[PDB]
Amino acid sequence: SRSNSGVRLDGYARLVQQTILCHQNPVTGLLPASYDQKDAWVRDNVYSILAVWGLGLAYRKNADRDEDKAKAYELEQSVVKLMRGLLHCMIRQVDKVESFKYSQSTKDSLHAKYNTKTCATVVGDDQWGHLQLDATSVYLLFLAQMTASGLHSLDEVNFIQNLVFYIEAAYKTADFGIWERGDKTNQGISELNASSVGMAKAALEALLADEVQHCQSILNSLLPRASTSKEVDASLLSVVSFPAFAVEDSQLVELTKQEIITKLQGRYGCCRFLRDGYKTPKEDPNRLYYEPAELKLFENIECEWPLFWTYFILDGVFSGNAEQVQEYKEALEAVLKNGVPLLPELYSVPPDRVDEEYQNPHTVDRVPMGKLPHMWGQSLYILGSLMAEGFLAPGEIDPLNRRFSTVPKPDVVVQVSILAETEEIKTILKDKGIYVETIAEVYPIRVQPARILSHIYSSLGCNN
Amino acid sequence: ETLWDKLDHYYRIVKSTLLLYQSPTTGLFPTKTCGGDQKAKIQDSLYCAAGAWALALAYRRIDDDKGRTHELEHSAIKCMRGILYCYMRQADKVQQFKQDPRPTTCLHSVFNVHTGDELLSYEEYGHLQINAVSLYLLYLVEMISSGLQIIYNTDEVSFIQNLVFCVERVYRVPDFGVWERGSKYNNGSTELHSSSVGLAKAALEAINGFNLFGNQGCSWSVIFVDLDAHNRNRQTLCSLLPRESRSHNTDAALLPCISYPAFALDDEVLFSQTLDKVVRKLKGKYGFKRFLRDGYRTSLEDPNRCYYKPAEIKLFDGIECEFPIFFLYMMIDGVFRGNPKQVQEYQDLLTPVLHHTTEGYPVVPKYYYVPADFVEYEKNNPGSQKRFPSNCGRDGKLFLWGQALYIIAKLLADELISPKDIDPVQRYVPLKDQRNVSMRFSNQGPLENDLVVHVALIAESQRLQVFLNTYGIQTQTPQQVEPIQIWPQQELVKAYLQLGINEKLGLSGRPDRPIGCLGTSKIYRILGKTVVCYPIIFDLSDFYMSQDVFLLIDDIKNALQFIKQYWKMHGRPLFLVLIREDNIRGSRFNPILDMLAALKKGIIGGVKVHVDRLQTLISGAVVEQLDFLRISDTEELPEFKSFEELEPGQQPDVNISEWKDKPTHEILQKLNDCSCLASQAILLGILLKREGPNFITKEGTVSDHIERVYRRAGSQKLWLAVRYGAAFTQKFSSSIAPHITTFLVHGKQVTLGAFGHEEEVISNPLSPRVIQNIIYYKCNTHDEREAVIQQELVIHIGWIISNNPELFSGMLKIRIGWIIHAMEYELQIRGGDKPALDLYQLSPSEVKQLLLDILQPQQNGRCWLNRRQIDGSLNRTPTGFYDRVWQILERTPNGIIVAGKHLPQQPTLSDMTMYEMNFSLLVEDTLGNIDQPQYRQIVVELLMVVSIVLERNPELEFQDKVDLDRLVKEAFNEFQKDQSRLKEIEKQDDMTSFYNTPPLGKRGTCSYLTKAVMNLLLEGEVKPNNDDPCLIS
Amino acid sequence: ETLWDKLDHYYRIVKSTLLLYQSPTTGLFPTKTCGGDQKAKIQDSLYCAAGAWALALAYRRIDDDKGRTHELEHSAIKCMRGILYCYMRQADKVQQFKQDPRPTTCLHSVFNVHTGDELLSYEEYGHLQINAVSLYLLYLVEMISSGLQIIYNTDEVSFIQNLVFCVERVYRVPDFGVWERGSKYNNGSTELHSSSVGLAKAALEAINGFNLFGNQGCSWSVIFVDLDAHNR
Ligand SMILES: C/C=C(\C)CC/C=C(\C)CC/C=C(\C)CC/C(C)=C/CC/C(C)=C/CC/C(C)=C/C
Ligand SMILES: Nc1ncnc2c1ncn2[C@@H]1O[C@H](COP(=O)(O)OP(=O)(O)O)[C@@H](O)[C@H]1O
């Protein structure tokens, strides 16, 4: 394997080490967002370790010598370390998981940012809009997937099931979104984003199916629209495709992808959503919120994010494709340091050229700003490259077969037992031709009302 | 005394009495220290090299050795790279021995000490001593582990592998043994010796995965043993373990095996059962007898005649030569096993028998013989006479093997070497440490066995995975596990064919056999990809047994139970339950779903299982890295195909006899008017004979129409046709031969052949093609439907012998034709007046339940005519039947005649011992001519009664030959007379009434027989006996 | 009694009286089972993790553990990757202690069980207990040898080496000791204790040449002790 596949694997090892693993904290295992943003986002940390997990998987499928075993073990244990660090980040907020379990309020939600040096909390609850069901759901989904891939207390198992209850009611819980700003208007208004709902559905499926299919109902109804205040969000690729695969309707997935391509895709990536204005030259940089009258200003000049084209390579790899047009179009990578791609966070219309871009959409030569490299995007870029170059397979990143969601599922035959409450009732049912068994006869199977089932689950997840 | 002085004492003895004799050229040591004999025996050189290495292990504890560590160690390498040379020159023979292990294809075990050339030929000497090839490999592992570099290049590694391929199949190669003669009788006969199989189990346990380069080693220097072949050696040793062979109930060669150097046995109760018999029956003042009735250099032995003639073996009883070396092995066993008083007891026994050379160096005489003038006195009072040494050392004669063992034992006893030092590979595992030693002990320990096999349910197609999920079972298609490759076992057999391939030495590779359930239960890294293999149970086959799903579910349970009982490797076993869409077709779905569901629950057959995704199951598991494949000659890596997703009558009316007397094209006429796939198989099977392989049929070549009817009724589950088809097309299963070895490894002998027809006796392991002649041509020449049913029972009995061995206890010769007879009768007794079902129409699984039911301990309830017919037909013997028949022969001067056979007191009493397995076979041969199976049970009962009368009454002894048939006839005639007095039954010479009478009861069968035996015994002298001298006399 | 029953007796005692108390977050166990003290002593957590690992070593002799080998072993890793966290946050102090081993430059030996932060200061508590850094390293070697994977990346290996550079020069750093007081007199005085130097001789004998990666390890994961400092 070292002839012509070990050298390229080592090249990707340098890529991941110099883009991702260089910034992993030896104490906590978390990844700071950038030099300016020293805090560690849950979702960004979960996504940024995908390249490391894929490299470890690559290294292992070819680990026979020691050195190769050493590299594979180092990568897998770095992934385990990052997930454990995020766990103690959530574990320290068990009082918030417990409170959000019953009262799903934005003031009782897990924080998105954490101190990358102590796994503690950096800002106050009031200070970031921490409710992001997608970050906790993506963490749970990849915890399920990594474990199903062979990556290894019961107290944290109880905590994980309490997190399952935490993200369980995500179909009816308003969220601050994957972009941690709620609605577009950007007034800190919690809103129900299909991205969060789909990620929660995927996490629950990978890890009670009633709320799962409630999330499925939300997804079917909302798609191809993102949420109440969004025609389309490019984050929906994380639901209709990798990593959630939460939509089992192939037509709906295709329609969502086509909406993203038609509305948000530009010369430098896909805009997050219409009238985003995250790093546009028209916003006020020092003003946190957005007045309702400046959202027009953001139209046709929204920043295009290269991160979303990593999703379009991932699907295309997960679903076989000649979408080798999404790759070869990511020549818009910063350095070709030495030659490291350094996938940018976004491209903004140069300020002078606002009128030309407004008028002539997706046509002006934008500049890269924001995080560089975008580790969430860079990890997906490296993973897609790995997968596309034959060093990885969909079944290794997805051992739970989440990709097989779109396949039509056959109708199910519901077995029903008609049970007589009393024997006299059984006698009447028989005179009329339905041969049944009484609830006493069905012993040792004990029939109970659904209230008892709901009460039983109240004893699941309890560690006092 | 300083250590230098303490060990200079041994260096003087080693250098004078052992290393002086080492060949300057070969490195091998000479058997005769003084003389013109050029013989270097393989075993004695290995023990001599071990003696020099033991001194080096001692001199390693001194930094200023003055060169003695390098010399003594490099002398050991010299002897071991000299045995390798002798073998490497005879590598034309290593290839021939892997393919056809035989007495005349073996590596020679005696070579010219000076040149390394073959000295004695196959006729002159019995060279098949696999104790020697196997101790070469145990010592090479134990010395390479110590730091001694014996294997130098990859070609030497390929020869050591080819040497391993030979040592794996020892269970099926009978040999001459450490003693070079075979049995106590020097008939020129090879027999399986626990000692040879035990050393092979130990070489294989030690060499599996041993870098033969040592510390300076990589993946391409490792030796790979077959977990399945090693199991077959473990199974053979344990079914011959308080004993040594069919001939020897104890041999002192068991002591080298059970304890240093091999330390093979893994049961502490068998070690004690084996050692105690060896010490009790073989120990002497001057040493341990090699075996009882041994004629080596005895005064009564004829020097000129090589082969002892029948009954000569008696002349050597009490005159047996006693070898002082066994005292040294017992001292080494004591140092290892922590008995500081077994070292002293046997040191004290050796200090007297030890001669000393002129310079004071101790000489361990090879044997101590009774001088001829004193032979009768020893025979009269054994242990009384004084036996002269064989070599005194001053004579110029030294036993180089014993000289070496003195150094090993004296150094170990004096604590100048440690048990750990001379057993670098830990062959001795102290009880408290018998937990995680691969191929021997598992985490659970020596006694507990609740293994959880790691099941992975793999589905042939996505369609089947989605179908199985709807019905409750999550399975994974071959593609969903993408990096992991699921391979048929046969694709690993192709890969292994490239292990040990040296074209310089003419070596070829692993022999092409099936990898089994303990080798398909491992995860392999072959050419950079992870390969897990589906078990051989899931391999498609022509035989009709495959069609019964119930047999597949049972083979899955049977395999997992074998994996539980016999997998002692580090990882959890990985069983992959390949599910094929054919398996769920029709009503096979309900049985398969219950197996698949129990596999999901975690228990199928008492074997706990963990079904999980292969990726999770293969994750931190130990993977056997198959690095021998390399690129080799071809610049391309070998092409290995991996399982891939398969993407989308009531009775035959035509009777054979009335339709075979016809030669007519009319058989081809009914062929067009037979809808019965059983009438078609009978009609289109008469013609595979009379008209030919291709006599044109309306359909086409006849060979194609029977294979179409066999295959068609196989699916339509029309089992009479499937069996007429298999037989007519002469179908044999790959598993008949692998299972017939379960019978043989377990000490049982299979007879194929019908009841009332030519039987044949497979007493030794045989090839599939020899076994096939025995079933379709040599034994069954009247009905070949019998060969398919007999093939069906060998497969069923073979797994029953492996997993439930005691459903076949009291059975030594398993007569499959007789067992089928018991089954046809059980169908009639079960049937009642309603006609009995035809065993042939019964489904393979229904034939397995009939067998399991007939084998079930006969319980209070059935007619004693039915109990007898089943027991007699199964040839079940009451426990100790064979020992009790010895006691009848010992107290009967002229022997027992049964059914025109005769067990005479001599030559058997003279040539055999009470518990000899050879005797059990002679008793079984004597009762061979008993055609009727219920008569066999009455004859087995007369013999059991004759044993109680003779034992309870020690005074009575038979004068003339006991005719067991006459004693039975006289018992029936008394019964006939007494029952006549009750009700005058008019049936004559019908013993049905007698057989139905219970054995013990008011007037049962046991009374009549006791009476008959007593009338015969009392017609002869009553010897006054002294145990209870007569009070009224 | 079956082994399952014999060892379920210890799992009930371990789970009630030891693993109930393990911090959900740090992995460290609390010195006071009941109360508002947040002190997790380093030595007591190591002895607690060793107790869970000893039960896992026992449950390894049963194939149907029902998850108890993974939990009891992974509890031990939790406590040991929690002491490492407490030390790894205080690695500004590991550098200062290698250069100037002193009572006020040491890694703290009592940390917040809930957060892993320093609880008592150098004035409040005598944190120079090299029995603790040294038993961390003896137990990390004894647990990584067992099959328990505690060190995950090269940076954790570099901290364990820097922890070793500190444990080598113990002969010249007087400490407070297992008993936290120093001498019989609680004068606030550090003295060389055979117990602290003895555990350091043992951590150094065990960790010289040890792949901290275990079986999944290479040359770049080995810890290197100074034969001369060990001699001292
Ligand atoms: C499973 C089968 C069984 C339990 C066997 C059942 C036993 C039966 C049918 C009877 C067996 C009887 C036996 C062995 C013998 C009897 C005796 C006491 C014989 C005496 C013969 C004799 C003439 C002795 C001389 C007495 C002396 C020495 C006088 C001084
Ligand atoms: N059809 C089969 N069913 C079960 N086990 C088999 C089969 N074929 C081979 N094996 C096993 O494979 C191993 C080696 O195969 P083979 O050389 O045929 O064995 P043997 O010589 O004992 O018949 C043995 O453990 C044997 O039992």
From Swiss-Prot, chain A:
* Origin: domain of life: Eukaryota
Taken from the UniProt record, the cysteine pairs bridged by disulfide bonds within this chain are none
Where does this protein reside within or beyond the cell? Cell membrane
Q: How this protein is processed and modified after translation, per its record?
A: Although the final Cys may be farnesylated, the terminal tripeptide is probably not removed, and the C-terminus is not methylated.
Q: In which tissues is it expressed?
A: Muscle specific. Isoform 1 is predominant in vastus lateralis muscle. Isoform 2 predominates slightly in heart, and it predominates clearly in the other tissues tested.
The task this protein performs is described as: Phosphorylase b kinase catalyzes the phosphorylation of serine in certain substrates, including troponin I. The alpha chain may bind calmodulin.
Associated pathology? Glycogen storage disease 9D: A metabolic disorder characterized by slowly progressive, predominantly distal muscle weakness and atrophy. Clinical features include exercise intolerance with early fatigability, pain, cramps and occasionally myoglobinuria.
Q: How does it assemble?
A: Hexadecamer of 4 heterotetramers, each composed of alpha, beta, gamma, and delta subunits. Alpha (PHKA1 or PHKA2) and beta (PHKB) are regulatory subunits, gamma (PHKG1 or PHKG2) is the catalytic subunit, and delta is calmodulin.
State the family it belongs to.
Belongs to the phosphorylase b kinase regulatory chain family.
Task: Report the protein name in the record.
Answer: Phosphorylase b kinase regulatory subunit alpha, skeletal muscle isoform
UniProtKB/Swiss-Prot annotation, chain B:
GO MF term set: calmodulin binding
The known PTMs are summarized as: Although the final Cys may be farnesylated, the terminal tripeptide is probably not removed, and the C-terminus is not methylated.
Annotated region Calmodulin-binding: the residues are 708-735, 860-891
What membrane topology is annotated for this entry?
Lipid-anchor
Q: Which GO terms fall under biological process for this protein?
A: generation of precursor metabolites and energy; glycogen metabolic process
Lipid attachment site numbers (S-farnesyl cysteine): 1030
List the record's Gene Ontology CC terms alphabetically. Answer: cytosol; phosphorylase kinase complex; plasma membrane
In which compartments does the protein localize? Answer: Cell membrane
Chain's role: Phosphorylase b kinase catalyzes the phosphorylation of serine in certain substrates, including troponin I. The beta chain acts as a regulatory unit and modulates the activity of the holoenzyme in response to phosphorylation.
Which disease annotation does the entry carry? Glycogen storage disease 9B: A metabolic disorder characterized by hepatomegaly, only slightly elevated transaminases and plasma lipids, clinical improvement with increasing age, and remarkably no clinical muscle involvement. Biochemical observations suggest that this mild phenotype is caused by an incomplete holoenzyme that lacks the beta subunit, but that may possess residual activity.
**Family per UniProt?**
Belongs to the phosphorylase b kinase regulatory chain family.
**What is the protein name stated in its UniProt record?**
Phosphorylase b kinase regulatory subunit beta
* Organism placement in taxonomy: Eukaryota, Metazoa, Chordata, Craniata, Vertebrata
